[PDB]
Amino acid sequence: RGYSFSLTTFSPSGKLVQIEYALAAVAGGAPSVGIKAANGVVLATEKKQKSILYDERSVHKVEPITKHIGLVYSGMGPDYRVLVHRARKLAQQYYLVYQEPIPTAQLVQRVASVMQEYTQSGGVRPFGVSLLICGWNEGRPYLFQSDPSGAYFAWKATAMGKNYVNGKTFLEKRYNEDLELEDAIHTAILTLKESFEGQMTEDNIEVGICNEAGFRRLTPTEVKDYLAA
Amino acid sequence: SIMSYNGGAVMAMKGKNCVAIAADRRFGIQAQMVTTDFQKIFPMGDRLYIGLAGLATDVQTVAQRLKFRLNLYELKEGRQIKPYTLMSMVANLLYEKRFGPYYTEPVIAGLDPKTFKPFICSLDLIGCPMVTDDFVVSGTCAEQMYGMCESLWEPNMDPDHLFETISQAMLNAVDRDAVSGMGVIVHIIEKDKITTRTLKARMD
Amino acid sequence: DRGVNTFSPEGRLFQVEYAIEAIKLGSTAIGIQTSEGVCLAVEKRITSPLMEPSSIEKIVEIDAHIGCAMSGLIADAKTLIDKARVETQNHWFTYNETMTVESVTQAVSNLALQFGEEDADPGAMSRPFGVALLFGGVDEKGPQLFHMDPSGTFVQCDARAIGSASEGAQSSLQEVYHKSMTLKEAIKSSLIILKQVMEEKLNATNIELATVQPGQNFHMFTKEELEEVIKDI
Amino acid sequence: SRRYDSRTTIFSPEGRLYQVEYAMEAIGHAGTCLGILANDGVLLAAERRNIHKLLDEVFFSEKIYKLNEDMACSVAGITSDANVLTNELRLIAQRYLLQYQEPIPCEQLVTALCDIKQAYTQFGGKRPFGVSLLYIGWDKHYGFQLYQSDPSGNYGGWKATCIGNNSAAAVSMLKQDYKEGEMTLKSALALAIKVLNKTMDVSKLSAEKVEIATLTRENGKTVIRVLKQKEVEQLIKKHEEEEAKAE
Amino acid sequence: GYDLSASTFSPDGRVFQVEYAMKAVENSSTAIGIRCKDGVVFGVEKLVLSKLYEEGSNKRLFNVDRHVGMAVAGLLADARSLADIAREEASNFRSNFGYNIPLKHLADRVAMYVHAYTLYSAVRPFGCSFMLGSYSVNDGAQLYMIDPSGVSYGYWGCAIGKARQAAKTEIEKLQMKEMTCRDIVKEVAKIIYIVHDEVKDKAFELELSWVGELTNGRHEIVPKDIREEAEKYAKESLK
Amino acid sequence: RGSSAGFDRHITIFSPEGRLYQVEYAFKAINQGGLTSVAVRGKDCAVIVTQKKVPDKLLDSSTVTHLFKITENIGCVMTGMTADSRSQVQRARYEAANWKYKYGYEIPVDMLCKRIADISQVYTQNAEMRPLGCCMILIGIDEEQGPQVYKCDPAGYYCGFKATAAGVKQTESTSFLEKKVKKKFDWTFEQTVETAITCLSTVLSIDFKPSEIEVGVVTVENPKFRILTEAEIDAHLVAL
Amino acid sequence: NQYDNDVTVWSPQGRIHQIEYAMEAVKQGSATVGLKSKTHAVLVALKRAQSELAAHQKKILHVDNHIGISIAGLTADARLLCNFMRQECLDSRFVFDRPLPVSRLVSLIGSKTQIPTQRYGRRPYGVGLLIAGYDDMGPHIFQTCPSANYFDCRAMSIGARSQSARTYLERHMSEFMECNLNELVKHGLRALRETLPAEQDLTTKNVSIGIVGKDLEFTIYDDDDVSPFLEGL
Amino acid sequence: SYDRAITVFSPDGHLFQVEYAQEAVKKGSTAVGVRGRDIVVLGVEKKSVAKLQDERTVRKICALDDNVCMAFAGLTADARIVINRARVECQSHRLTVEDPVTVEYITRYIASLKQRYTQSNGRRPFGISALIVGFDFDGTPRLYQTDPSGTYHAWKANAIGRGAKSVREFLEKNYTDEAIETDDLTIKLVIKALLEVVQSGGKNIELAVMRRDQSLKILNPEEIEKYVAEIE
């Protein structure tokens, strides 16, 4: 019939430990890197399948929400998708009211408000998913991180996943505020190289960019061109 | 015809880098006036006004339901609304009660808050948006000021020509309508200022 | 650790078994059914001298012909004695007759064991009632007196004491009661037994007495009326 | 299921609500947020937590969240639960305006959120909102006001108060350098920076670690204005220099 | 504490509340059913506890539709509950599709009702296995059996109860695929008496019900003229 | 290694290392059936092959099956708890028919594994319900993408495959059959059935009879899902 | 230890302790005896002495004009179950204008009693009922249990020390189907007397008798009406 | 809907959540009400003044209607729900009866609401007691006290909160007809009872007096020091 009590409660130290444990699910996930350049945002993640038998052109970790908003995760695969199909639905519920493409900050405020609700509603665990969300609205690029608590943060560049603390130190060295988009894709790929454990190819990662032409994830023919440099 | 109960006439006209909106001042019952100061034009922005005619309980309700939703919008979105987006906000509000509609046909008139691009619109009672570049009318004397603004409107008017056009098209229409009149208020919305002139009309 | 609807290994349904132990902390109430009327006498158990004793309403009107006497958790009784009053008025509305004393007891005791925590209502009782009720009145069958334990077990009694000193006042009721005594002799017998069992000195402030006769209605004694009875004891 | 339930809304055997008292310690390790009432305004002085080098500057503030034309709040605790509360105060503030065509009085807005907060401490079996949050505002009936609202659901009007980390040390400094009926706005900005030095463990302030908003009246209209980086850097340097002229 | 709910797997991936509920079937007396060339014959070893019960109390053979019968074993109050569920599904099928429900579909609709109580902490699994059996001209003889987990398999012979393994060896040496229904009843009664323990559980009343071609596909109790001519046959080979 | 604190053992909440300790037990529930299913797609075909252990002589072996027909064009093989198996098949058959009723075309294998996995995610996030101890492997022919073999699991993860195994010998038959995804294409024609059978024959060391397995195919020439008869399987089993 | 608090929890022995504890509630109530001839069906019950002053209980209830029940266990669960049975017998006479058959009433009880034995947070009905009836098929002595199956009995007794009655009833059940009305009731009185302490006997104050028959509607017999039946025992 | 029994019985017949809600009352600030001849005086004991309160909005003597005002002790947030739901009922009673409430009517409404959360699913009891004072239409002054159990009694004088076991021992030895004679002497009976409980002493209390029509007014801080100097 459904449990009506919160599974996330405060610990005596003042902590919501089910959220703090859902962060541990995120920090064990595959590394995801977002970089906001001056004319675009690049979202790159490690799409490293377990075996050769897995179809790489089947499921996607960089998913578009609108024509101008895409997002990527570190954490749990299936919790991402319930959260990425509601994000696509919240984006069209805005568009039916306002007939304007949703601002990127407003989508992140609606997605994180959902993620807050499964930290307080009855009989549910939080999501084990953080989200790097990108978008282009009003001539400005946007990059947000949505933590499993439901808190959102606008980032110039950040990283999640395994070795995120080592990776986010690598962003603080090689991030110029006045980069272009084509120079930010290389620095996003290099962060996925700082912890990869192998030889990364066009199928072992997944890159998504968002410029004023909208959001799109890069084709594996286009990923190979950036790996040559 | 229930929208002729209180009467009323609102008209919005586009100029060059400026818009004008105008309404009558009469509040009434089927043929009886009560006040001559009834507000039908409401400030939905810095330089963006909505004008509502029709049944006067819905002129007051929809302007308050829209001020409800716009203040939620301007706090959450952190910016002022664009005049195209207010149009879709009103069109959602009027269609959400489609069966049993709000008996108002609002016009909006404003400037784009980051382009100063002029915008006028008109909606039906169940929210069908009409964007025009010439003029929009709404009210009891619609046909009086359709043909009145088909002659007087010229493209690319100065703010002083725009005031003398929308005010000669309101006065000649509501003096030919029985349940519209008792004054005309005109807002000229320009980039630097909002000028508001009530003007001498026939009080019959 | 266990739910409210849980049987003991002895089959006792724990929460009712503990709601019976709640009555043994409430003040002592005595009822005696005679052929000439019933009497209801309860200890008020004055806690502080500043407490106004006219607010300790441990005896209430149900209808003009039925009065109830309570012990235990007095706040829990007020939902039972209001459902008692509405049921007598719904019976009068439909049938234009006074409701009998047994069927008012039968309707109130259907609310006992109507608790639970699994969609029993949108607003349902979490727990049983911590009260015993002594209904007493005169119906078409004559004077009657009923007991209303929290298990919903209702029983007609000739004389019944409930409360903290029931086991010891029920031993005194079985000795002095007989099936032909008078209501004056039952009012007097309900105060010798209250004298044995009350802690404070028994006066006309810390007791509460009410009778139901076949002729007259329910009435509760005044301060001047109780003074005559206590001098006779 | 009774096994999996934690009983968030029951009493302790000492008469306490554990999840409320445990939500109070989530706030004592949040960002330090204080508010000072003056004779011509109220301010908020939140110590900024998200002070990383690679953070952007999207929306107007970090922990202010203007509620109304005439009143703003400031939150400390769970960041996510504060966003749910601040959408709710904006709904209450606009349902009053829809119903009365007057702006919500500031005590009536704090009271209505504190009823929603109390309701999660008494029924429903949910955890409370671990957000204590300040309030500044103007209304017709009492003018400039300042409120604080704990997760218990009880509130209070203050002349100077502080929530967040090192709030107890911040209150005692506000007990002595605050003067009732004698604080101007410019005197209260300097008191805000004075408290935000002995209650932040860092060596000094840099205005990337604080956020200040003031609320004043200007020609019959309440203005709520987050101070920019240069406006606070002048206030830090006016206190980093004047402390040298007192020793 | 991995066994207090049906919404909990064990660390080796088992739902013990389902597996405890099939211990309840294993504490019930053996009910067998044999699918033959002409139909399906059920048989229940019905343990009569007291002499004070009337002959026919606690009936274990149910009619869930006019062509489908149901032999149960386990917690009997749960069995009468699922017999009502199987009657509602057979009723709703005819009210929505206009013909008698196939035994394949009826067994799958009921097994997914049983499965629905193996998933949640709000309910417990059913404490009963039960066989279903029907006959049609088109579909032929069919015998399905549903476990408390909710799994339904088709059988030529099933033997739910205490002496489950001991009765399956007697059904396996029978060659039911060529035998007719009046020959199976003489054999079902043999298998019931040979698996009954005349020491542990004392008194028992044999219940037999077929459904087959000789009844034009109606499910009914075997008549006493044929029932007593099989109980006499069963004791004669029990020696 | 794996810490635990609270009711991580019983309901789907997070371990202190964020593991969903309860969801990992539904994968152990797939091995409880003792069976192994092998799926492989070719260039014009996709094949499912699973063990058929009729352990009783009295079972009607026509009803002991793990292959299921979801639509006319989508086939299924199930591995795990057999009752949880049949529930997910009826939910897949129901979700595939709402697609045709709402959208007017036959559902892809793409979006049927996605919807069934979105149902399985709800079991891993609500405490009131356990996950289903079973995994579904769907096959079919898309219009543009061709043969598809998609597998969803109790976690809610539904990725696509060139070749899948599931159940007890899953690791022994993934490590085997990934060596045949070497030089070209695992013989990508109609005798990927022989790739599927010899994969299941090696990890079981069985060298099957004609009626010890059951095979389900789709093709481009026949997009309908067919279950092979034992005479058709023995035509392949005698070829190896 | 941990398998007895909930009704949705099987023990590792295939056994539900919460159901078996509710059957303990009916084995510690009061002995009631039911039996039938080829013409009548008789319910005899001990109105138990709660005290020396209580009109003891009422333990035989009218359900229809052809069905009455007798109560062992929780009395408030009984009349909660009897008001369902009274409604289900009015439901048939409103719809079919005929007496509802006795075997179909008890099948509606056992499907209504099974529902709380399987859902969380609900308890089994802690009450046993002996049900006498006269359908078109004859007399009927259905017994129902908290474990919601039911039993068509030739004779049955439930309650405290009721095995002594079942010892008596199983000896003399060979002659029940050829009795008169007064002969059949006296077998139920001798069965009910077997459940008594040695210091106790069957007075007219503690015995109720419920009889239903062919040309006889269901009647309960009070204190003065059981005197023609106790005149031989 | 969260339907779980929170207040359940225990062995020896106790409701723990009701007993533990009464321990929340004993941790609250002390409230005293006495009842004079034509005057009822409520006084609460402000524990801390701190020189930074806007004291207008932490007042513990509310006003239910024009004739009924109450003072509480316990969980302050639970009281504000009880104060507001009593104010709605005082207005519904003017709607249907065309008369102001009696003091025992709104006491029955508050007590039956407080009983209701001791017996409903998914609710804890209110952690407040309420000293309710008022006047009838006849003009008789009334003083009532509700508990978290839902029990209510009338009182000549009562004390709730911390130290109330000592304030009630004080009032049971000092409440007479002579100290309840003058209206000003009745006000000093609360202030003398509070100063036995205020462990810091001084003018750190709040006190509201309600006489008849020309009704309730809460006394100012310098208007309270005039009485404390008259008892020094």
Side-chain angles (χ1 to χ4, degrees), chain C residues 2 7 109-110 152-156 158, chain G residues 5 18 21 53 55-56 58 75 79 124:
Chain C
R2 68 177 76 256
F7 288 96
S109 67
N110 284 323
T153 297
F154 68 100
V155 54
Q156 182 177 1
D158 283 330
Chain G
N5 292 318
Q18 199 64 242
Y21 291 168
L53 295 173
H56 299 283
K58 62 176 182 290
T75 61
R79 64 184 179 272

PDB file of all heavy atoms in Angstrom, chain C residues 2 7-8 109-110 152-156 158, chain G residues 5 18 21 53 55-56 58 75 79 124, unseen atoms left out:
ATOM      1  N   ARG C   2       5.220  -4.312  18.763  1.00  0.00           N
ATOM      2  CA  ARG C   2       4.033  -5.040  18.356  1.00  0.00           C
ATOM      3  C   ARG C   2       2.923  -4.037  18.073  1.00  0.00           C
ATOM      4  O   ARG C   2       2.917  -2.924  18.599  1.00  0.00           O
ATOM      5  CB  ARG C   2       3.599  -6.056  19.425  1.00  0.00           C
ATOM      6  CG  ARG C   2       3.097  -5.432  20.697  1.00  0.00           C
ATOM      7  CD  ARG C   2       2.626  -6.462  21.691  1.00  0.00           C
ATOM      8  NE  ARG C   2       3.684  -7.171  22.396  1.00  0.00           N
ATOM      9  CZ  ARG C   2       4.059  -8.415  22.128  1.00  0.00           C
ATOM     10  NH1 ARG C   2       3.494  -9.080  21.134  1.00  0.00           N
ATOM     11  NH2 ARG C   2       5.017  -8.986  22.840  1.00  0.00           N
ATOM     12  N   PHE C   7      -2.803 -10.330  19.463  1.00  0.00           N
ATOM     13  CA  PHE C   7      -3.231 -11.203  20.538  1.00  0.00           C
ATOM     14  C   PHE C   7      -2.029 -11.675  21.332  1.00  0.00           C
ATOM     15  O   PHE C   7      -0.973 -11.968  20.769  1.00  0.00           O
ATOM     16  CB  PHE C   7      -3.989 -12.414  20.001  1.00  0.00           C
ATOM     17  CG  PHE C   7      -5.349 -12.094  19.494  1.00  0.00           C
ATOM     18  CD1 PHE C   7      -5.560 -11.866  18.148  1.00  0.00           C
ATOM     19  CD2 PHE C   7      -6.421 -12.017  20.361  1.00  0.00           C
ATOM     20  CE1 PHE C   7      -6.817 -11.568  17.676  1.00  0.00           C
ATOM     21  CE2 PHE C   7      -7.685 -11.721  19.893  1.00  0.00           C
ATOM     22  CZ  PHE C   7      -7.879 -11.493  18.551  1.00  0.00           C
ATOM     23  N   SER C   8      -2.212 -11.766  22.643  1.00  0.00           N
ATOM     24  CA  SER C   8      -1.277 -12.441  23.515  1.00  0.00           C
ATOM     25  C   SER C   8      -1.261 -13.929  23.197  1.00  0.00           C
ATOM     26  O   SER C   8      -2.188 -14.441  22.571  1.00  0.00           O
ATOM     27  CB  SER C   8      -1.676 -12.219  24.970  1.00  0.00           C
ATOM     28  N   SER C 109     -20.620   0.208  23.313  1.00  0.00           N
ATOM     29  CA  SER C 109     -19.609  -0.836  23.376  1.00  0.00           C
ATOM     30  C   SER C 109     -19.250  -1.403  22.009  1.00  0.00           C
ATOM     31  O   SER C 109     -18.289  -2.170  21.915  1.00  0.00           O
ATOM     32  CB  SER C 109     -20.078  -1.951  24.297  1.00  0.00           C
ATOM     33  OG  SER C 109     -21.186  -2.611  23.729  1.00  0.00           O
ATOM     34  N   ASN C 110     -19.981  -1.053  20.953  1.00  0.00           N
ATOM     35  CA  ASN C 110     -19.520  -1.344  19.605  1.00  0.00           C
ATOM     36  C   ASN C 110     -18.374  -0.445  19.172  1.00  0.00           C
ATOM     37  O   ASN C 110     -17.686  -0.778  18.206  1.00  0.00           O
ATOM     38  CB  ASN C 110     -20.662  -1.226  18.597  1.00  0.00           C
ATOM     39  CG  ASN C 110     -21.604  -2.408  18.639  1.00  0.00           C
ATOM     40  OD1 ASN C 110     -21.181  -3.541  18.839  1.00  0.00           O
ATOM     41  ND2 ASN C 110     -22.882  -2.157  18.406  1.00  0.00           N
ATOM     42  N   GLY C 152     -15.386  -4.037  24.990  1.00  0.00           N
ATOM     43  CA  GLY C 152     -16.704  -4.101  24.415  1.00  0.00           C
ATOM     44  C   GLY C 152     -17.592  -5.149  25.024  1.00  0.00           C
ATOM     45  O   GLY C 152     -18.613  -5.494  24.430  1.00  0.00           O
ATOM     46  N   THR C 153     -17.226  -5.681  26.181  1.00  0.00           N
ATOM     47  CA  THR C 153     -18.029  -6.680  26.873  1.00  0.00           C
ATOM     48  C   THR C 153     -18.970  -5.941  27.805  1.00  0.00           C
ATOM     49  O   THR C 153     -18.541  -5.343  28.790  1.00  0.00           O
ATOM     50  CB  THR C 153     -17.143  -7.651  27.640  1.00  0.00           C
ATOM     51  OG1 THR C 153     -16.318  -8.369  26.719  1.00  0.00           O
ATOM     52  CG2 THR C 153     -17.981  -8.626  28.427  1.00  0.00           C
ATOM     53  N   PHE C 154     -20.256  -5.964  27.496  1.00  0.00           N
ATOM     54  CA  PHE C 154     -21.222  -5.292  28.339  1.00  0.00           C
ATOM     55  C   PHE C 154     -22.124  -6.306  29.023  1.00  0.00           C
ATOM     56  O   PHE C 154     -22.508  -7.316  28.430  1.00  0.00           O
ATOM     57  CB  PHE C 154     -22.038  -4.262  27.554  1.00  0.00           C
ATOM     58  CG  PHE C 154     -22.959  -4.833  26.532  1.00  0.00           C
ATOM     59  CD1 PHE C 154     -24.307  -4.984  26.803  1.00  0.00           C
ATOM     60  CD2 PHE C 154     -22.500  -5.147  25.271  1.00  0.00           C
ATOM     61  CE1 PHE C 154     -25.158  -5.484  25.855  1.00  0.00           C
ATOM     62  CE2 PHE C 154     -23.349  -5.651  24.324  1.00  0.00           C
ATOM     63  CZ  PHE C 154     -24.677  -5.816  24.616  1.00  0.00           C
ATOM     64  N   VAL C 155     -22.440  -6.027  30.276  1.00  0.00           N
ATOM     65  CA  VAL C 155     -23.099  -6.974  31.157  1.00  0.00           C
ATOM     66  C   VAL C 155     -24.068  -6.207  32.045  1.00  0.00           C
ATOM     67  O   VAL C 155     -23.767  -5.101  32.500  1.00  0.00           O
ATOM     68  CB  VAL C 155     -22.044  -7.782  31.954  1.00  0.00           C
ATOM     69  CG1 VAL C 155     -21.085  -6.880  32.691  1.00  0.00           C
ATOM     70  CG2 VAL C 155     -22.690  -8.705  32.937  1.00  0.00           C
ATOM     71  N   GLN C 156     -25.259  -6.763  32.235  1.00  0.00           N
ATOM     72  CA  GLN C 156     -26.203  -6.212  33.193  1.00  0.00           C
ATOM     73  C   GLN C 156     -25.822  -6.641  34.601  1.00  0.00           C
ATOM     74  O   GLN C 156     -25.571  -7.822  34.851  1.00  0.00           O
ATOM     75  CB  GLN C 156     -27.618  -6.672  32.869  1.00  0.00           C
ATOM     76  CG  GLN C 156     -28.662  -6.117  33.792  1.00  0.00           C
ATOM     77  CD  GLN C 156     -30.046  -6.536  33.400  1.00  0.00           C
ATOM     78  OE1 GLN C 156     -30.232  -7.271  32.434  1.00  0.00           O
ATOM     79  NE2 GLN C 156     -31.037  -6.066  34.145  1.00  0.00           N
ATOM     80  N   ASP C 158     -26.711  -6.187  38.921  1.00  0.00           N
ATOM     81  CA  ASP C 158     -27.542  -5.669  39.997  1.00  0.00           C
ATOM     82  C   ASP C 158     -26.805  -4.614  40.804  1.00  0.00           C
ATOM     83  O   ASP C 158     -27.382  -3.588  41.172  1.00  0.00           O
ATOM     84  CB  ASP C 158     -28.000  -6.803  40.902  1.00  0.00           C
ATOM     85  CG  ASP C 158     -29.128  -7.607  40.304  1.00  0.00           C
ATOM     86  OD1 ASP C 158     -29.925  -7.036  39.532  1.00  0.00           O
ATOM     87  OD2 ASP C 158     -29.225  -8.806  40.619  1.00  0.00           O
TER      88      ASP C 158
ATOM     89  N   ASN G   5       4.076 -11.631  16.374  1.00  0.00           N
ATOM     90  CA  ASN G   5       3.450 -10.329  16.535  1.00  0.00           C
ATOM     91  C   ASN G   5       2.567  -9.941  15.363  1.00  0.00           C
ATOM     92  O   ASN G   5       1.668  -9.116  15.532  1.00  0.00           O
ATOM     93  CB  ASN G   5       4.515  -9.259  16.732  1.00  0.00           C
ATOM     94  CG  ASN G   5       5.241  -9.406  18.044  1.00  0.00           C
ATOM     95  OD1 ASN G   5       4.634  -9.679  19.080  1.00  0.00           O
ATOM     96  ND2 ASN G   5       6.556  -9.237  18.009  1.00  0.00           N
ATOM     97  N   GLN G  18      -0.244 -15.725  15.151  1.00  0.00           N
ATOM     98  CA  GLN G  18      -1.267 -14.750  15.498  1.00  0.00           C
ATOM     99  C   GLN G  18      -2.657 -15.320  15.264  1.00  0.00           C
ATOM    100  O   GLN G  18      -3.604 -14.953  15.962  1.00  0.00           O
ATOM    101  CB  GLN G  18      -1.040 -13.485  14.680  1.00  0.00           C
ATOM    102  CG  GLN G  18      -1.700 -12.237  15.194  1.00  0.00           C
ATOM    103  CD  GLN G  18      -1.162 -11.824  16.540  1.00  0.00           C
ATOM    104  OE1 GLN G  18      -1.885 -11.776  17.523  1.00  0.00           O
ATOM    105  NE2 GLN G  18       0.130 -11.577  16.600  1.00  0.00           N
ATOM    106  N   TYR G  21      -3.115 -17.782  18.219  1.00  0.00           N
ATOM    107  CA  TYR G  21      -3.367 -17.100  19.479  1.00  0.00           C
ATOM    108  C   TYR G  21      -4.790 -16.580  19.551  1.00  0.00           C
ATOM    109  O   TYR G  21      -5.336 -16.427  20.644  1.00  0.00           O
ATOM    110  CB  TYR G  21      -2.381 -15.951  19.677  1.00  0.00           C
ATOM    111  CG  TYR G  21      -0.951 -16.370  19.930  1.00  0.00           C
ATOM    112  CD1 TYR G  21       0.074 -15.444  19.888  1.00  0.00           C
ATOM    113  CD2 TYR G  21      -0.626 -17.687  20.215  1.00  0.00           C
ATOM    114  CE1 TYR G  21       1.373 -15.813  20.116  1.00  0.00           C
ATOM    115  CE2 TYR G  21       0.669 -18.065  20.438  1.00  0.00           C
ATOM    116  CZ  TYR G  21       1.664 -17.122  20.391  1.00  0.00           C
ATOM    117  OH  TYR G  21       2.960 -17.503  20.617  1.00  0.00           O
ATOM    118  N   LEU G  53     -23.278 -10.860  41.225  1.00  0.00           N
ATOM    119  CA  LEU G  53     -24.338  -9.875  41.103  1.00  0.00           C
ATOM    120  C   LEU G  53     -24.633  -9.476  39.665  1.00  0.00           C
ATOM    121  O   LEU G  53     -25.457  -8.581  39.447  1.00  0.00           O
ATOM    122  CB  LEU G  53     -23.985  -8.614  41.903  1.00  0.00           C
ATOM    123  CG  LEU G  53     -23.874  -8.732  43.421  1.00  0.00           C
ATOM    124  CD1 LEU G  53     -23.348  -7.440  43.975  1.00  0.00           C
ATOM    125  CD2 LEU G  53     -25.220  -9.062  44.022  1.00  0.00           C
ATOM    126  N   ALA G  55     -26.211 -10.091  36.008  1.00  0.00           N
ATOM    127  CA  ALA G  55     -26.971 -10.823  35.006  1.00  0.00           C
ATOM    128  C   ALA G  55     -26.020 -11.177  33.882  1.00  0.00           C
ATOM    129  O   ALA G  55     -25.543 -10.290  33.172  1.00  0.00           O
ATOM    130  CB  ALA G  55     -28.139  -9.989  34.491  1.00  0.00           C
ATOM    131  N   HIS G  56     -25.800 -12.479  33.700  1.00  0.00           N
ATOM    132  CA  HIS G  56     -24.477 -13.009  33.393  1.00  0.00           C
ATOM    133  C   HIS G  56     -23.930 -12.501  32.060  1.00  0.00           C
ATOM    134  O   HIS G  56     -22.927 -11.784  32.029  1.00  0.00           O
ATOM    135  CB  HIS G  56     -24.543 -14.531  33.427  1.00  0.00           C
ATOM    136  CG  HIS G  56     -24.927 -15.083  34.762  1.00  0.00           C
ATOM    137  ND1 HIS G  56     -24.046 -15.162  35.818  1.00  0.00           N
ATOM    138  CD2 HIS G  56     -26.107 -15.554  35.227  1.00  0.00           C
ATOM    139  CE1 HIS G  56     -24.657 -15.678  36.865  1.00  0.00           C
ATOM    140  NE2 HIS G  56     -25.911 -15.923  36.534  1.00  0.00           N
ATOM    141  N   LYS G  58     -25.326 -12.194  27.480  1.00  0.00           N
ATOM    142  CA  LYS G  58     -26.158 -12.904  26.522  1.00  0.00           C
ATOM    143  C   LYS G  58     -25.208 -13.516  25.504  1.00  0.00           C
ATOM    144  O   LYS G  58     -24.336 -12.829  24.967  1.00  0.00           O
ATOM    145  CB  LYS G  58     -27.233 -12.014  25.882  1.00  0.00           C
ATOM    146  CG  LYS G  58     -26.817 -10.825  25.047  1.00  0.00           C
ATOM    147  CD  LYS G  58     -28.070 -10.186  24.463  1.00  0.00           C
ATOM    148  CE  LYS G  58     -27.769  -9.000  23.554  1.00  0.00           C
ATOM    149  NZ  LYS G  58     -27.262  -7.819  24.296  1.00  0.00           N
ATOM    150  N   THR G  75     -16.544 -10.923  22.913  1.00  0.00           N
ATOM    151  CA  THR G  75     -17.958 -10.692  22.663  1.00  0.00           C
ATOM    152  C   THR G  75     -18.189  -9.505  21.743  1.00  0.00           C
ATOM    153  O   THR G  75     -19.218  -9.445  21.064  1.00  0.00           O
ATOM    154  CB  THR G  75     -18.698 -10.480  23.976  1.00  0.00           C
ATOM    155  OG1 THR G  75     -18.157  -9.336  24.638  1.00  0.00           O
ATOM    156  CG2 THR G  75     -18.547 -11.689  24.872  1.00  0.00           C
ATOM    157  N   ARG G  79     -20.538  -9.715  18.067  1.00  0.00           N
ATOM    158  CA  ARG G  79     -21.657  -8.959  17.532  1.00  0.00           C
ATOM    159  C   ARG G  79     -21.243  -8.037  16.397  1.00  0.00           C
ATOM    160  O   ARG G  79     -22.103  -7.609  15.621  1.00  0.00           O
ATOM    161  CB  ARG G  79     -22.347  -8.167  18.638  1.00  0.00           C
ATOM    162  CG  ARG G  79     -21.512  -7.112  19.263  1.00  0.00           C
ATOM    163  CD  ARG G  79     -22.255  -6.454  20.405  1.00  0.00           C
ATOM    164  NE  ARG G  79     -21.409  -5.444  21.013  1.00  0.00           N
ATOM    165  CZ  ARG G  79     -20.549  -5.701  21.986  1.00  0.00           C
ATOM    166  NH1 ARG G  79     -20.448  -6.927  22.472  1.00  0.00           N
ATOM    167  NH2 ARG G  79     -19.795  -4.736  22.478  1.00  0.00           N
ATOM    168  N   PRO G 124      -6.898 -11.310  13.452  1.00  0.00           N
ATOM    169  CA  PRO G 124      -7.999 -12.251  13.253  1.00  0.00           C
ATOM    170  C   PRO G 124      -9.149 -11.966  14.204  1.00  0.00           C
ATOM    171  O   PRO G 124      -8.982 -11.377  15.270  1.00  0.00           O
ATOM    172  CB  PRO G 124      -7.361 -13.608  13.556  1.00  0.00           C
ATOM    173  CG  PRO G 124      -5.933 -13.400  13.335  1.00  0.00           C
ATOM    174  CD  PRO G 124      -5.644 -12.010  13.760  1.00  0.00           C
TER     175      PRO G 124
END
